[PDB]
Design an enzyme around this catalytic site. Sequence first.
Site, PDB file in Angstrom:
ATOM      1  N   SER A  78      40.943  45.726  41.409  1.00  0.00           N
ATOM      2  CA  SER A  78      39.916  46.303  40.564  1.00  0.00           C
ATOM      3  C   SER A  78      40.090  47.786  40.330  1.00  0.00           C
ATOM      4  O   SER A  78      39.298  48.407  39.624  1.00  0.00           O
ATOM      5  CB  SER A  78      38.556  46.093  41.262  1.00  0.00           C
ATOM      6  OG  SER A  78      37.981  44.873  40.837  1.00  0.00           O
ATOM      7  N   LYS A 240      37.274  54.626  42.234  1.00  0.00           N
ATOM      8  CA  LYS A 240      37.233  53.216  41.923  1.00  0.00           C
ATOM      9  C   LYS A 240      38.045  52.460  42.978  1.00  0.00           C
ATOM     10  O   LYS A 240      39.229  52.654  43.224  1.00  0.00           O
ATOM     11  CB  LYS A 240      37.661  52.851  40.495  1.00  0.00           C
ATOM     12  CG  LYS A 240      37.446  51.365  40.266  1.00  0.00           C
ATOM     13  CD  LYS A 240      35.999  50.969  40.155  1.00  0.00           C
ATOM     14  CE  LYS A 240      35.814  49.456  40.188  1.00  0.00           C
ATOM     15  NZ  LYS A 240      35.813  48.991  41.601  1.00  0.00           N
TER      16      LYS A 240
END
EC number: 3.5.2.6
Length: 259
Positions: A78, A240
Amino acid sequence: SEPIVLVIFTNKDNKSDKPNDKLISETAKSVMKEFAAAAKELNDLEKKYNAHIGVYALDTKSGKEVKFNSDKRFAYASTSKAINSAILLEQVPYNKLNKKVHINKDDIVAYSPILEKYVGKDITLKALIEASMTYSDNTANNKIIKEIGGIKKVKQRLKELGDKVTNPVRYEIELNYYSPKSKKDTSTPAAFGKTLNKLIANGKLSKENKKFLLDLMLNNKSGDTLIKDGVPKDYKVADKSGQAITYASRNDVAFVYPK
């Protein structure tokens, strides 16, 4: 305050191993020690957690780089959400992000806590990006890739930025089925970190889009145990995170503002 770009990918030798987020924390603490004018070895941390660490860090002001297994391949999981978001934001001005796209049943993939409520409804590009970056919504990321033109186009943009290592092949969630014998949906810390600098920190985004994106990353709570945990207090971290299904593949990428 130009940031430091920090990419930390880790994995372990067995399919079913489970990650320890403290490894990334500790990795981050050590590497940040390198940017001042004392620190554990990365080797020792690999020994302590029984894991493989890949690190690439670039101080965008000075140009200095810290590398450790910087050319080994890891599944990015991700963390690619950031790249995909950015690519779409190179092509859609902040003020046209209220454009809506239709979401149907066929778009939906697993782990879509936001998007699963929009089946048969229209959602704006901005909410797509919010969903993907803050909640790690897999449907949102896939729609984003589709809006860009498909995996097809992502791959060609990376080639244009000079990244011939990052290899996107599948959509969510299948990209998380990492196998050390496959290059699919892997990159190396250096390739990915250089791509993140060229797309976001030092890219062609507008100031609004850049800000919008980085705000999402700063305010994301899913990375609190990671690089955010490791750097001192005083540092803003926009990250992230990611985790693949196999081999305890656990990653975090960030823009670190020591001021």
